[model samples]
Target: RHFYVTGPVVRGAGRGGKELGFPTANQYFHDTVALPADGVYAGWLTILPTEAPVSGNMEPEVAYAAAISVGTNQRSVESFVLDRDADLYGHDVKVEFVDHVRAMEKFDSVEQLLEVMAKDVQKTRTLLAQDVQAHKMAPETYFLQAE
Candidate 1:
């Protein structure tokens, strides 16, 4: 049987985030302009991006819950922050962005970056715990397919 797991992945425009230590997937949003206010949020990584519309669902499309970074750059504060560049180039990755972690910040050295990254990972874990709890309580919200 095919089933999916829950976790937040670094979602972005490309794969550059992964090279810089922040690995993310491309997010698929119908209206970029209408997305949530710029900020990091916790979400789940739906491995299978494509999902056909259920009997009463909205429509046929891909689905993935994620901690989305609305508008920010992991590389530079001046750049538009397209994506991580590791996953899909044209495919849209959807991240549900649960909790806003923190505003993007710059580090003076690699060590500092590493330190902050650790903290960020901890925060992600905390948010993930909550997400897991919610899912466990609402297990019916998901499908039991192969991972």
Candidate 2:
């Protein structure tokens, strides 16, 4: 089934930015929300609003190409925005899954994890690129095809 969720960004283990180069906006989802299987996915993340002030390139209603990760034991959604680099703790984000890249995995080491992450990001870019219909028809709901 088609799955997506727009939820408030909550604090996570803080490892995405602090430990890894990839920074993510974490969102907690209830059982009421239908989450996709545990995996890495290519998708769109729109930060909804016209805030008073901001420091990053994140704009209201504009969806950025995102590398999204979903998991269980505590249903969650964490998106690693490909380009923007601002904090999104308070932002309400809508994450729509486009395609699956790979299953959730465990790497032996941090080095191994980064290697997979690199691939995940690249695959996300390539997959989202071919989503022409989503890019054009989705005018009001934007996805910056920032290549």
Candidate 3:
């Protein structure tokens, strides 16, 4: 179950408030690479920076559990790193997929979207729980403050 996608991230468009936003690092395929079926997924990622440093809790070579989204054409990856809020726009990230969460879905409203996304985050957490333990899938390292 390996679907690895790596690319530089982009800044998110204007949006937001506190408690309910799970922003993602946008990884655009520049699509010669093979990609998965484009859905929500449970995975791990590392934000690479051989350069000096940018800022925030996004340290280099560390793995974080995430909820990932891909486009219908495999042109982009948007990863939402759980429990951590840090901008990743200037970094190139490697996302390794461990499990498929769901196919593309549409919501009736933003409220509906929020609820489902929360559930998606839950799935991402548990799936990676299995991955990290069974395969040491995090490689360099893995993280989660919860059980």
Candidate 4:
């Protein structure tokens, strides 16, 4: 089943890139939200506008290749941009899962976790890069629709 979540980028525990070496945009999703089975996923993420009067003459709507993790520390859903980095705080974001990589597991040590995470990121990049259409959601499916 395909699952998706959309919300504003929120402050995380400040340990993603700093501690894990992979930065992510943590979303502010509800605790009651139904998430897919806890796993790392290859997905797409779109950053949406926060205000009205959406500009049509701006940069084309772009969706990044995202490595999505569902249900992590503190029940967080975080998306790491595959190629670029940005401070997305307060910006609306939508993430759509394309395929599941592996189930979440607790490693005995932080180094073990880092090793697995590195592989996960590589898998996400390879899979997403193979499918152009699946790498980015079309405008119609975006959370912020054009008017």
Candidate 5:
């Protein structure tokens, strides 16, 4: 009853974001790229940047984490921090698609981008607060509840 939990959806589109300066961790899907639509999301990423390197694995590193992004390239290279000034080429990244924050948009200029980003970041912070509270409220009896 399970399906694709995680996988890369785009090829070359996904690469070492660190090259640009924001080494982001992402996930890619192969068969059905049936994802949560395209938008900027606010959620924790699960990266393994320092796992046992496969030596020849495609991904450069493996420390995953909660990531955010503006799916697709219409917003293009200018819409994301990683692509804004980074030059990732050979690094492989695994990003878990988290919560959708907002839809991708083309702003008038950098000022507009900053304005929107600031808002997004604020929203992200709000979501993270919820996560923190949820973590603290987690039941101590996590295993015996299956009986």
Candidate 6:
């Protein structure tokens, strides 16, 4: 089943891309939001602006191909996988889950974790591409509806 969560970006444990390679934007949602089983997932992440633009070029509302992770790594943290750097510290984003990849697990070494993350990124990229083509539609931008 598909699910979605919308929240503002919040400061996360200063690990992820910095130390792990896969940069992520952590989100802060409500306590009542029910997440799928604790695991990694492939999904679409929409970064929305707080206010509408007036004249300048409008920011593209692209549903970024994202790898979503929902887990409690010492502390409950929700992170989004991205291929590049972005400063979305206080920006709001909506993540739409497509499918679950695998359950979260502890590894003996950091190298092992990096290996798995690489594979996860590959899987997410392929799956999301397939979804877009299968649906015969462009990337979605509904989450950032007109303010």
Which residue ranges in model 3 land beyond 4 Å of their true spot? 16-20, 137-140
- lDDT for 144 (candidate 4): 24
Model 3 C-alpha lDDT per residue in residues 1-147, reported as the tens digit of each score: 576877677765536323458677877774667878778998877886567474778687887888898875438787888888776777888898889999989999889988988899998888877766786553456766444
Clashing pairs in 2: none
What is the per-residue lDDT of model 6 for residues 40-141, given as tens digits with 9 covering 90 to 100?
888877666557432322243657667788865433336554554566666677778987778988887878888988787777777777666666554344
RMSD of 2: 2.5
Model 4 steric clash pairs = none
RMSD to the true structure for each prediction, in A, is 9.8, 2.5, 2.6, 6.4, 9.3, 5.9
Tens digit per residue, CA lDDT, model 2, 1-147: 236789788898876464678887889877667888888999988777755454577777777889998888678888999967877877777898989999989999888988998899888888888784554555665554545
Predict model 4's lDDT versus the native. Answer: 0.69
Error of 5 at 83 (Å): 18
Off-target runs (Cα >4 Å) in candidate 4 are: 50-60, 72-75, 133-147
Ranking by TM-score: 2, 3, 6, 4, 1, 5
Question: 53-72 in candidate 5: lDDT tens per residue?
Answer: 43322333322223266455
What ranges in model 2 sit over 4 Å off? 50-52, 133-135, 138-147
Better of 2 and 4 by lDDT: 2
lDDT of 3: 0.77
Q: What TM-score, computed on C-alpha atoms, does each candidate reach?
A: 0.50, 0.86, 0.86, 0.75, 0.49, 0.78
In candidate 4 the C-alpha lDDT for residue 6 amounts to 84
Candidate 4 TM-score over all chains jointly: 0.75
Sequence-dependent TM-score of model 3:
0.86
For candidate 3, the 10 contiguous residues with the lowest summed lDDT are 11-20
Model 6: CA > 4 A from native: 52-60, 73-77, 139-147
lDDT of each: 0.42, 0.80, 0.77, 0.69, 0.40, 0.66
Candidate 5, superposed: residue stretches over 4 Å from native: 1-31, 49-67, 73-94, 135-147
Over all chains combined, what TM-score does candidate 2 have? 0.86
